[PDB]
Amino acid sequence: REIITLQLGQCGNQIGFEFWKQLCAEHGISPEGIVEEFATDRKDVFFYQADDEHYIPRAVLLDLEPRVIHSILNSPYAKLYNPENIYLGNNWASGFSQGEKIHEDIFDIIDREADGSDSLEGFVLCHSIAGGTGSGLGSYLLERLNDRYPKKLVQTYSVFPNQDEDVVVQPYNSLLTLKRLTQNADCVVVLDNTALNRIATDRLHIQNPSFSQINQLVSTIMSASTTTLRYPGYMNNDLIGLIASLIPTPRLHFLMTGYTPLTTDKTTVLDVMRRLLQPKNVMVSTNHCYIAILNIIQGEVDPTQVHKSLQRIRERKLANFIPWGPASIQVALSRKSPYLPSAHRVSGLMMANHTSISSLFERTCRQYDKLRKREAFLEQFRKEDMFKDNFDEMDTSREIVQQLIDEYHAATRPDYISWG
Template identity: 75%
Template sequence: MPREIITIQVGQCGNQIGMEFWKQLCPEHGIGKDGVLEDFATQGGDRKDVFFYQADDQHYIPRALLMDLEPRGINGIQNSEHRNLYNHENIFVSEHGGGAGNNWANGYHQGEQVVDDIMDMVDREADGSDSLEGFVLCHSIAGGTGSGMGSYLLETLNEQYSKKLVQTYSVFPNQMETSDVVVQPYNSLLTLKRLTLNADCVVVLDNTALNRIAVERLHLTNPTFAQTNSLVSTVMSASTTTLRYPRYMNNDLVGLLASLIPTPRCHFLMTGYTPLMVERQVNMIRKTTVLDVMRRLLQTKNIMVSSYARTKEASQAKYISILNIIQGDVDPTQVHESLQRIRERKLVNFIEWGPASIQVALSRKSPYVQTTHRVRLLFVPTLSFFNMIISCLTLSLSLSLSLSLSLSRAHTCTGKERKRKHRAHHCLS
């Protein structure tokens, strides 16, 4: 029996990456833009019910909730070519329509006011599931709605659905550029506390790294939001492929996370994916092997968290765990030989107190999507954690080397704002 997952998209960023996610999932399951199953999509052996359900007229509807405090992002989805895909009863826009003003406290307070309407939508979707496994939250930690309202929603889900998994795809701000939002560091740190306490798994996606990968690997001069969001949707799709096209192992979300998260608080994960392509590069095909894709993703420049990619501390980082999700027709013997060569060359540095092994999950490819490469791989590591005190949160956080550097930059930005005597009361409710 498939274990259903409900996707919750909060704020402009969350709805944009969520829309790209559904645009990618539909072709992989042979579902058209209006939710109607294509005539050829009958023998795929896939689990559509994990992320979709069928309406009375047999068309497929995503198990998705779309919510925002301003109508702009939602209107873009409702005017797109996928506007008939979603259940319009699962779309929430604040009656005031003024948004959160990029203020965490404002978004949190408005979330508290509308939580009954939102939880009615969540309960309705949960009641329509046969065996609900958990929730996936898509949001940004830098704005007002995704951070503030998303934080309140995390607390509510943790309270009312304490036995269900909550996984987030959290987009971190670009640390290399000065933001127009002066309270962005406060938004990030306040959201981080809720992610630490209320989420079971946080997949960190760094805007800095996404832009760097788009420029250096995809050779895009000025990557658009749609192009960087497509990188996020690729990771989301690949990370759920074993749930949707199951084999004999890792057929549910808890099985995937069990090998990655040794203790409940060590749940901040990074990702890398190869090969990445855009439409105009369809003729630039190279040969892919299991060893090739594994070695590529051990290079820090291919990780979608950029804070330690080019620092001397990168060589000192130790892995707690690694999960490789391999898509394609792969001989298990090739996987074993590739892992053996990686061990012999000592390409991976693991912690001393844990099992020094790379977990591998083999996944089938969608028969409805023609891929140009034989092997594709999603790399999900958990790095060694260093203790770090974030004073303004009054919370001791154990974070990986890469994440601690990313967060220390956010903390530094907060310190700069305080030195400038910025009016912190704008961030307090």
């Protein structure tokens, strides 16, 4: 149906601004949202359609300690939207309490936008894990929606914070955030800072403004994942039809992504498939096996090569996945995009559930457990002191992520016939 976008936090509002500029340049519209005559499309999912065809986006903007939100405010794309929804620490409990006191009027903003929609499919939020102001607040509003609406979906695109370890309560905050993510969300798409750092240092030579190019890559991914919605396809034009195959189980619902060019400034279906089989073309860093993989391709493809390719892909066994049961790769095609120069013609996007990401969770678990053994790294800030006097929510989150990692490590096994 219709999908409502949400954005909060400094990194989330940055990537949302980049996503809307991406879809502004991508389709034939003005930076005030007037349709271009020279351009057909559906933009009714993420944009409300007006009478002069002002495709005003379904983007609710929440801010706390605004500095870059002011730069979003005075912009030549500030005529695209004005839904009148902008409403004003670096701790999880701080952002949790700040969202707690204003939950009513932001819920009025939610219900107003819900009344703006006739039907609904899902909520996306722009969020970053352990982002400071975003952390805790995002978990709180996730709790609010999960309490309010069991009839809809939530998709979440968020990055894993790694700054190569002043902030030492960051593993605690990310742990509590991911606890709410496993239990109160239905599907998670997670990425790494380090893998995008690798691809950025390979494709280019920039080190300091890396955030900006990260925003570009996030925008390309978020357009790619939505192309079968925005350009009219004929299958999985609901989100739940896309999500249904990849997630059999309500705790292992974390999805990793890839995209075939590292630098984007013929390719055949065989080439782009085997490139997409690499972890260096995947933007997330015993043998680990996928449960299921999905691929969507967009470009100038020849339809007869593709059956040749998946024949030979069976034959070489260039993937190694065996959960326990008959769940394999799903390949799909979307339109090569007009209204932009189509260079690097064929490009693919890849979506899988793989057990290896548990190791990265385990790395964070190893850090948090170490700090939990010392118990000197909450720094006795008053916010976490009010919200839990005994700090037992950290132990509850520890036992939940223990269940999660154990479910992961059992999910590797070909005896996962039971407990799936």
